[PDB]
Amino acid sequence: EIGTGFPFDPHYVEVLGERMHYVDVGPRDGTPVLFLHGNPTSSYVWRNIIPHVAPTHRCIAPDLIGMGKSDKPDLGYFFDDHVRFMDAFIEALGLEEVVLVIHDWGSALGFHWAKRNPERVKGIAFMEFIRPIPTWDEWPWFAGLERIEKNFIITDPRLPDNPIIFASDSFLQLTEYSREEILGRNCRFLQGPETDRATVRKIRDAIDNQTEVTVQLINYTKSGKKFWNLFHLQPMRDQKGDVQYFIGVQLDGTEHVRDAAEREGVMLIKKTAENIDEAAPFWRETFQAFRTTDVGRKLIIDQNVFIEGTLPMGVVRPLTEVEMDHYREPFLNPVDREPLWRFPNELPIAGEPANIVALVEEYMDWLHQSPVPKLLFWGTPGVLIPPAEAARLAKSLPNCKAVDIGPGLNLLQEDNPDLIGSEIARWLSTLE
Ligand SMILES: CCCCCCOCCOCCNC(=O)c1ccc(C(=O)O)c(C2=C3C=CC(=[N+]4CC(F)C4)C=C3[Si](C)(C)c3cc(N4CC(F)C4)ccc32)c1
Ligand SMILES: Cc1cc2nc3c(=O)[nH]c(=O)nc-3n(C[C@H](O)[C@H](O)[C@H](O)COP(=O)(O)O)c2cc1C
Ligand SMILES: [Cl-]
Q1: What does the UniProt induction comment state?
Q2: Is 225 exposed, middle or buried (0-12, 13-18, 19+ CB in 10 A)?
Q3: Nearest residue (CA) to ligand 2, atom 3
């Protein structure tokens, strides 16, 4: 299993009148590697990465102020507050040059620090980072829905060849493929020799006409088992009425009951498609409600929805109870939940807040002209970084090597720590 323990002795340092906790392991003479977590996590999100780096390099992972084992003073916990504390933390440890490993709001911290101190950053690994998000349409409404008891997939017709970017657990059961064997491919891989080609044209024509179609079709499991697949597809449109996704709903079994009962099956998958489409904007409207005072604080501070509801929906795989208690630990007291609510209100989406938008633009500009080595991880569908944006950055950023970690949402270290860690370790070998 992926590791659930946290086998690191605590270290502490006084920072602007407040105590911060950090992990500090590995050798001590060379360039240190600084790990910056974001919301709603802590140095715990790095627990299975650091062991890949520790044999060769020093590993420093602080808990942001207000989080983890660090003190919890009375602040607004604005991004500017975290900036002051991290500035002071780095100076308090005496750090000179560093390599950065950064995630979420840790990455706004790391990129903002590098822009102001470029000759001290010898390389940057980043994943799911803070970028200006132009429109709420780019926020994936489907994030974290893999366990919904409904057989459906989402395709992104704007990626080459309309690949699958989401597959519910049910769809894995039906086809016998794992999520890593499904995402990023066109759903036509389920077809085989006895698939009626005239039916495949009916699907191809309808998709080209951006229109719904319902068919029954011969498909194959990963193990070669033929089965009748009764499935319905239909587009989803964004706020401009343009198709940004297709939704597919499949019915379970080799059927063979695809007659008379077919009229009930057809009605069931059509009804499921409509119900999912009806709910998609409410799924996405949750973060918008977070970004409000009276409702957002009742959800996140009074109810703890960010820990109990958003955090598991940022991992494709299920988090165990042990792992959920580690993330719960700093926030058992409702009064300590301020940084959970202020972070999403700082996110630069659709131009607000203007001050954070400007700041992230400034360091994005820096990163585009900086020769510093860059290692970027991304998953499907991701949350902050959709695949298309990962692809764009892989070509825009100089000295950038991009790594696809497989299925992933926001806490990519939790879906595939062994790849992220080993990739970081080989990368570090190629540096100065
Ligand atoms: C730096 C950037 C950070 C990255 C952020 C990552 O973003 C990931 C996606 O964002 C999701 C935002 N949206 C919500 O959080 C949300 C919305 C609605 C619901 C809902 O129930 O309708 C919930 C929600 C729960 C919500 C609250 C819950 N309590 C409060 C008590 F403490 C328990 C429980 C669940 Si629940 C254990 C009954 C639950 C289950 C669920 N199905 C399980 C799986 F099959 C999907 C879906 C939603 C919930 C959650
Ligand atoms: C949302 C969606 C779901 C689909 N699901 C399946 C499926 O489950 N099985 C299948 O054989 N084809 C499925 N397809 C069809 C293929 O992806 C493809 O569009 C079809 O084979 C016609 O295209 P082609 O002639 O270029 O192969 C789906 C298409 C969409 C848009
Ligand atoms: Cl956030």
Answers
A1: By 1-haloalkanes.
A2: exposed
A3: 248
CA distance 49 to 204: 44
Index of the ligand 2 atom closest to the CA of residue 175: 8
List, in sequence order, every residue forming a beta bridge with 166; answer none if it has no partner: 154
The tokens describing 78, both together, are: 């604005």
Structure determined via: X-ray
The answer to whether residues 174 and 246 belong to one domain is yes
Which domain CATH number covers 244? 3.30.450.20
- For residue 303, the ligand closest to its alpha carbon is 1
Resolution in A: 2.4
Are 104 and 58 found together in one domain?
A: yes
Closest ligand 2 atom number to CA of residue 188: 16
For a ligand 2 pocket test, name from 187, 269, 277 the mutation site with the most ligand atoms within 8 angstroms of its C-beta.
Answer: 187
CA distance 426 to 86: 27
Q: Is 238 in the pocket of ligand 1 (CB under 6 A)?
A: no
Strand ordering across the sheet containing 243-251: 164-167, 152-155, 243-251, 226-237, 213-220
